[PDB]
Amino acid sequence: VLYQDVNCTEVPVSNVFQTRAGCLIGAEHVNNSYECDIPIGAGICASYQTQTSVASQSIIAYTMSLGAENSVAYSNNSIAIPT
Amino acid sequence: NFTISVTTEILPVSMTKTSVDCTMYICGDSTECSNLLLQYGSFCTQLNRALTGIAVEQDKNTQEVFAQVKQIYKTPPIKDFGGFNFSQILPDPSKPSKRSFIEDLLFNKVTAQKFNGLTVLPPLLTDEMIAQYTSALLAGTITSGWTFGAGAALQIPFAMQMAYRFNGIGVTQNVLYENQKLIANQFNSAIGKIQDSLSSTASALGKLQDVVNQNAQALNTLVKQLSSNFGAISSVLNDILSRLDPPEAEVQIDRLITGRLQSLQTYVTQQLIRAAEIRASANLAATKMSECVLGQSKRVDFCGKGYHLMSFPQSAPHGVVFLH
Amino acid sequence: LYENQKLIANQFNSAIGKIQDSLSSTASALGKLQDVVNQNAQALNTLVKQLSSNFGAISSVLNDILSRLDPPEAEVQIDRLITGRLQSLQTYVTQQLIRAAEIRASANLAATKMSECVLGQSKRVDFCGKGYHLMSFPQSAPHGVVFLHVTYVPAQEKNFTTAPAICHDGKAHFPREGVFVSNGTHWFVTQRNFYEPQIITTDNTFVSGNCDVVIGIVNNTVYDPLQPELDS
Numbered sequence: 001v002l003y004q005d006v007n008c009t010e011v012p013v014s015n016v017f018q019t020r021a022g023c024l025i026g027a028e029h030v031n032n033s034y035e036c037d038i039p040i041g042a043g044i045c046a047s048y049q050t051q052t053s054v055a056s057q058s059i060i061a062y063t064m065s066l067g068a069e070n071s072v073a074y075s076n077n078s079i080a081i082p083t
Numbered sequence: 084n085f086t087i088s089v090t091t092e093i094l095p096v097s098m099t100k101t102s103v104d105c106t107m108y109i110c111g112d113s114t115e116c117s118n119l120l121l122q123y124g125s126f127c128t129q130l131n132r133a134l135t136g137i138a139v140e141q142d143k144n145t146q147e148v149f150a151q152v153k154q155i156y157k158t159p160p161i162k163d164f165g166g167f168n169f170s171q172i173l174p175d176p177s178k179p180s181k182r183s184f185i186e187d188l189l190f191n192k193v194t195a196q197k198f199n200g201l202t203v204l205p206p207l208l209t210d211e212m213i214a215q216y217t218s219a220l221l222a223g224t225i226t227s228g229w230t231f232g233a234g235a236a237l238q239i240p241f242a243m244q245m246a247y248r249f250n251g252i253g254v255t256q257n258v259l260y261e262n263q264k265l266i267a268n269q270f271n272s273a274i275g276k277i278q279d280s281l282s283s284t285a286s287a288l289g290k291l292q293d294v295v296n297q298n299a300q301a302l303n304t305l306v307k308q309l310s311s312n313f314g315a316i317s318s319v320l321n322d323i324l325s326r327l328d329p330p331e332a333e334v335q336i337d338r339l340i341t342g343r344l345q346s347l348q349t350y351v352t353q354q355l356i357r358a359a360e361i362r363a364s365a366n367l368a369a370t371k372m373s374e375c376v377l378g379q380s381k382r383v384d385f386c387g388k389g390y391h392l393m394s395f396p397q398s399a400p401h402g403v404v405f406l407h
Numbered sequence: 408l409y410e411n412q413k414l415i416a417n418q419f420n421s422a423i424g425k426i427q428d429s430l431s432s433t434a435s436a437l438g439k440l441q442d443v444v445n446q447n448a449q450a451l452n453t454l455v456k457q458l459s460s461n462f463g464a465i466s467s468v469l470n471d472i473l474s475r476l477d478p479p480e481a482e483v484q485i486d487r488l489i490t491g492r493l494q495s496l497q498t499y500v501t502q503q504l505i506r507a508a509e510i511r512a513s514a515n516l517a518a519t520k521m522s523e524c525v526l527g528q529s530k531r532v533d534f535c536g537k538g539y540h541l542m543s544f545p546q547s548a549p550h551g552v553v554f555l556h557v558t559y560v561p562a563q564e565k566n567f568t569t570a571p572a573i574c575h576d577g578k579a580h581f582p583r584e585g586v587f588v589s590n591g592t593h594w595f596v597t598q599r600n601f602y603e604p605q606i607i608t609t610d611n612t613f614v615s616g617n618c619d620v621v622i623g624i625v626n627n628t629v630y631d632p633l634q635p636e637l638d639s
């Protein structure tokens with residue numbers, strides 16, 4: 001469940017994670033980024049993960065990786081030509 | 084003899100993803116009001132559906148116009164661009180985000196609405212990552228030519244890229260090869276002039292300010308319509324509840340609720356047309372982002388007054404700007 | 408192309424096969440058409456469902472109201488019910504016209520894509536599809552069109568040490584179209600979007616000015632084709 005503007009202390013009156021869009025209840029935060037599936041808000045984005053050790057089914061909510069960060073190695077006299 | 088005349092063209096990409104919760108906007112969280120609103124039927128669900136559709140459309144607009152490149156690129160720290168100075172547009176560390184001074188000038192030249200069920204849904208892409216996309220696009224169009232949009236990026240000298248753009252236009256690369264220093268000086272002068280123009284006059288940045296103001300005035304009028312009675316005898320529904328009894332209260336609240344719902348219908352329709360226009364302009368922006376941001380368009384006066392050379396994108400509140 | 412015709416055909420047909428499998432695997436790959444059809448049918452479903460509401464009148468069955476009340480009061484009752492249904496139908500029509508305009512814009516975009524990606528070859532990158540564009544094969548679909556875009560995409564790249572230009576007698580040499588790269592000590596000129604060895608000659612490159620003013624130029628030999636022929 002996703003809440004917008006409650007500051008998440010008012011939810012009961014489980015796991016809570018607060019973003020600029022409010023908090024999620026029952027959400028595993030993951031620092032390890034992923035190109036995500038279901039936009040939530042403020043870039044925070046959620047999906048479902050099948051585990052094998054503890055809680056073999058869970059819902060993760062992570063910061064959205066903008067992509068595989070690649071750094072081209074530019075130089076003044078270095079060109080790349082596709083072969 | 085010629086010149087390079089940088090120019091800014093500004094295009095909105097998305098309005099604010101305004102939402103509505105009917106039960107609390109139309110009805111002052113009352114029981115009889117909720118019963119009557121359900122008695123009108125499935126209007127409220129249709130309204131919330133239209134608004135969430137608009138929100139999804141804004142999300143798709145931003146994602147489709149910006150994230151045309153899969154990998155996020157990193158600008159190499161060194162700056163030996165044959166004399167071209169990109170300090171104003173390349174990311175700067177000490178800024179609060181990985182922004183550039185151009186959008187830092189842009190941000191400041193851009194311009195009650197809650198507790199009434201009007202929840203401003205947060206934008207999906209926050210400003211930091213939009214700036215990250217702009218940085219990646221800039222790095223791709225500087226150090227990889229037009230190739231990185233097509234497939235994988237390719238290490239390309241900047242002089243080579245600009246010379247190939249010349250050759251595509253029709254002027255032969257001999258001109259650039261003989262004038263590199265002068266061309267770099269020309270571009271630096273032009274970027275200084277455009278920096279001064281953006282730092283002095285915001286009258287050019289009319290499109291985004293106008294669309295945001297239009298949305299704000301529409302929402303403000305939507306809120307202000309609550310005070311009106313629409314033929315009813317009291318503005319606040321609670322005052323009607325005070326002494327008026329159900330035999331008369333039913334008809335009174337019927338008039339009031341049909342008026343308020345008609346006002347909300349007008350607002351949602353207005354938002355529908357404005358969002359459609361914004362999405363049309365956003366498809367135009369994306370087609371610009373593809374035609375000459377990731378290349379150069381032999382067609383004239385689409386993305387530049389004159390023979391186009393290149394373009395640099397920059398973010399802005401709810402919009403994008405192009406340095407042609 | 409004539410160096411790799413069979414390879415081109417093989418890749419083409421493997422691509423056709425992967426398209427077959429990708430389409431036949433999951434339904435949501437084809438999403439836009441499903442989105443439009445579902446949106447239209449669901450809006451119409453809401454429209455027809457709206458008839459069940461009394462809109463504040465005595466009931467929703469109009470014939471029941473006709474049987475129940477007298478014309479002097481059925482006047483006001485049916486007035487309320489008809490104005491409610493009229494409002495619902497009106498908002499349905501307005502939203503239908505909104506989506507009609509959206510579909511019309513999409514259809515004009517499709518017309519452009521058909522007249523460019525099919526009736527010709529549009530150089531505009533990322534208009535036909537990812538990468539440079541070659542052609543497109545239109546195919547029908549129930550209330551919609553689908554495009555099979557054929558694209559050229561660089562796959563394997565090797566970086567080389569390159570030079571903006573070269574000068575043989577001080578006068579600078581600029582390629583007619585190529586990039587002065589050097590595999591090893593031997594320089595080579597080749598078109599931008601492929602690798603092709605070429606011994607530097609007068610055909611590949613024109614000569615202008617002198618190489619004092621250009622930047623990054625390298626000293627390199629410029630062979631000539633006329634000399635070996637005139638030797639005899």
Ligand SMILES: *[C@@H]1O[C@H](CO)[C@@H](O[C@@H]2O[C@H](CO)[C@@H](O)[C@H](O)[C@H]2NC(C)=O)[C@H](O)[C@H]1NC(C)=O
Binds near residue numbers: 084265
């Ligand atoms: C062509 O025109 C450009 C500008 O239109 C000239 O560039 C100027 O050169 C002077 C040198 O006296 C500099 O002080 C200026 O800063 C340059 N820029 C501008 C905008 O004036 C250039 O000299 C002209 N001639 C050639 C051969 O390029």
Ligand SMILES: *[C@@H]1O[C@H](CO)[C@@H](O[C@@H]2O[C@H](CO)[C@@H](O)[C@H](O)[C@H]2NC(C)=O)[C@H](O)[C@H]1NC(C)=O
Binds near residue numbers: 171
């Ligand atoms: C590009 O222009 C900018 C704007 O002036 C330069 O940034 C500053 O330049 C001054 C001197 O012109 C330096 O004293 C500052 O330290 C610079 N600040 C930063 C944050 O860079 C920049 O140096 C110029 N770059 C090139 C390559 O010319």
Ligand SMILES: *[C@@H]1O[C@H](CO)[C@@H](O[C@@H]2O[C@H](CO)[C@@H](O)[C@H](O)[C@H]2NC(C)=O)[C@H](O)[C@H]1NC(C)=O
Binds near residue numbers: 592594606
């Ligand atoms: C780079 O590729 C070329 C492609 O043929 C190799 O061949 C050389 O071509 C030049 C032509 O200017 C000859 O002078 C050389 O004798 C060729 N090298 C041979 C036959 O071994 C070239 O060798 C390659 N260089 C490297 C360093 O791999």
Ligand SMILES: *[C@@H]1O[C@H](CO)[C@@H](O[C@@H]2O[C@H](CO)[C@@H](O)[C@H](O)[C@H]2NC(C)=O)[C@H](O)[C@H]1NC(C)=O
Binds near residue numbers: 624625626
């Ligand atoms: C290409 O060869 C020319 C030969 O003249 C070089 O020019 C001389 O360079 C030396 C330094 O190496 C200077 O002391 C002379 O004054 C230059 N003379 C002339 C007439 O240019 C040139 O430097 C060489 N360039 C490269 C890239 O090797």
Ligand SMILES: *[C@@H]1O[C@H](CO)[C@@H](O)[C@H](O)[C@H]1NC(C)=O
Binds near residue numbers: 007018
């Ligand atoms: C919640 O409320 C506190 C009140 O002290 C405020 O400081 C905080 O910023 C709010 N939001 C949070 C904790 O995410």
Ligand SMILES: *[C@@H]1O[C@H](CO)[C@@H](O)[C@H](O)[C@H]1NC(C)=O
Binds near residue numbers: 029030031032
């Ligand atoms: C995620 O990063 C924060 C940053 O300090 C850290 O406190 C937390 O333990 C990290 N959690 C995981 C699962 O990596």
Ligand SMILES: *[C@@H]1O[C@H](CO)[C@@H](O)[C@H](O)[C@H]1NC(C)=O
Binds near residue numbers: 078
């Ligand atoms: C040019 O590139 C070489 C490496 O190929 C490097 O050593 C040199 O410092 C560079 N010089 C300039 C002015 O870019």
Ligand SMILES: *[C@@H]1O[C@H](CO)[C@@H](O)[C@H](O)[C@H]1NC(C)=O
Binds near residue numbers: 078567
């Ligand atoms: C070519 O690129 C590789 C990485 O892909 C790099 O390790 C190597 O130094 C580069 N060499 C040249 C000559 O650019």
